[PDB]
Each structure stands twice: as C-alpha cells, then as structure tokens.
Amino acid sequence: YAKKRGWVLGPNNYYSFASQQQKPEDTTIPSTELAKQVIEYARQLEMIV
C-alpha cells in the first residue's frame, strides 16, 4: 500500500488525504428546467379542445 496507494509511514503516522468533495451548489440553477416544468402543465390543460 506504500507503492500502490499513499499511506506512507512517516513519523509513526499514516497520512490518508482528504477524500472530501467541494459541493458547489446554488440549487436555484434548476430555473430553466423548473420554468420548463411549469409549461407542460398549462400545455396539458389546454391543446385538447
């Protein structure tokens, strides 16, 4: 595991790096698909006359 991965024995200590994500979120950025999602509502109400 020293040669395959890291986990190198330093001063009697293994170092495993941070596998933590960053999570870049706005989540209002579903604005186009949410504006899209409203359109087929009024479409399916109308258009069959």
């Binding site: 209002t28 604005s31 186009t32 949410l34 504006a35 409203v38 359109i39 509502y41 109400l45």
Partner: protein
C-alpha cells in the same frame, strides 16, 4: 349611424327605391320600425355603409391603443398575489361542500327534470372549475415570470 337619400314623388306610379339586379338589399338592416314611422319609405330611402378599411391604419390603431412592453414581465409581486390565493380557496371550500350536497343526493326525482327545475347559474359545474381556471392562470403566469427573471437577470 345611417345615411339616406331623398326620393321623388314623380315615381308614385312606379317603384320607389328603384333597386335592381343584386341580392345585397336584404342585408345591413331591415327597415327599422322607429325609422319607417317617419318618411321611410315614401319620402327618402336608406343606403348601405361599409368602411374603406386598410392596413397601416388598422395596425397602428390596434398596436398603439392597447400595448404594454415592460409590463409584460412585471410581478404585482406577492403581498396581494398570495393574498388573492387565499381569497378564492375559502369560498371554493364551501362551494365544494355544496358540490358534495347535490352529488350524494342523487335521487330518482325524474333526474332530467330535477336538473332543469333548479338551473340557477349555480354549484355543480358552473360555480365550479371556473374558479379552478382563475387559480391556475394567476399562479402559473406569476411563477413562470418569476423563474425567467432569475434566468435573464444574471
């Protein structure tokens, strides 16, 4: 508005309103009773009116009297919009309870006669989904314009 033309008395032995080979005389008006009590149709005759109506005057009177450019994406925002979302639902609740009443009634009181002796512009379908239409049109156009302003403005 009406237009007229004075007829002679020399054609008293002949046909006053001397009209001929066309079938557009019975249109545009029958001679009205309030006008034939006067000198119609033995002193003057009526005559037809249509309009020299053209483009570039039709469209400039259409598009300039009723138009709104920046109003097309305003908000009327939410303090009265969401308040109006309370203003309809409340009596729509009670009108739904009135819709409960007629449907669970469902008695053979000769039901084609029972439906016709209580026409009142009332509950079951007339005072129904008309409100559902107004709740639908107000909220979609509100929320769809809200999502676009987030899209367009940054």
């Amino acid at each position: 508005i009406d237009a007229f033309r004075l007829i002679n008395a020399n054609m008293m032995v002949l046909g006053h309103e001397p009209r001929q080979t066309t079938s557009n005389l019975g249109h545009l008006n029958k001679p009205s009773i309030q006008a034939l009590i006067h000198g119609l149709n033995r002193h003057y005759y009526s005559i037809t009116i249509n309009y020299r109506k053209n483009e570039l005057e039709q469209k400039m009177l259409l598009n300039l009297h009723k138009k709104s450019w920046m109003e097309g994406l305003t908000l009327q925002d939410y303090s009265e919009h969401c308040k109006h979302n309370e203003s309809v639902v409340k009596e729509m609740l009670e009108l739904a309870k009135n819709y409960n009443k007629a449907v669970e009634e469902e008695d053979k009181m000769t039901p084609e006669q029972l439906a016709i002796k209580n026409v009142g512009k009332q509950d079951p379908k007339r005072h129904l989904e008309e409100h559902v239409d107004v709740l639908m049109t107000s909220n979609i156009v509100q929320c769809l314009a809200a999502m676009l302003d987030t899209v367009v403005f940054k």
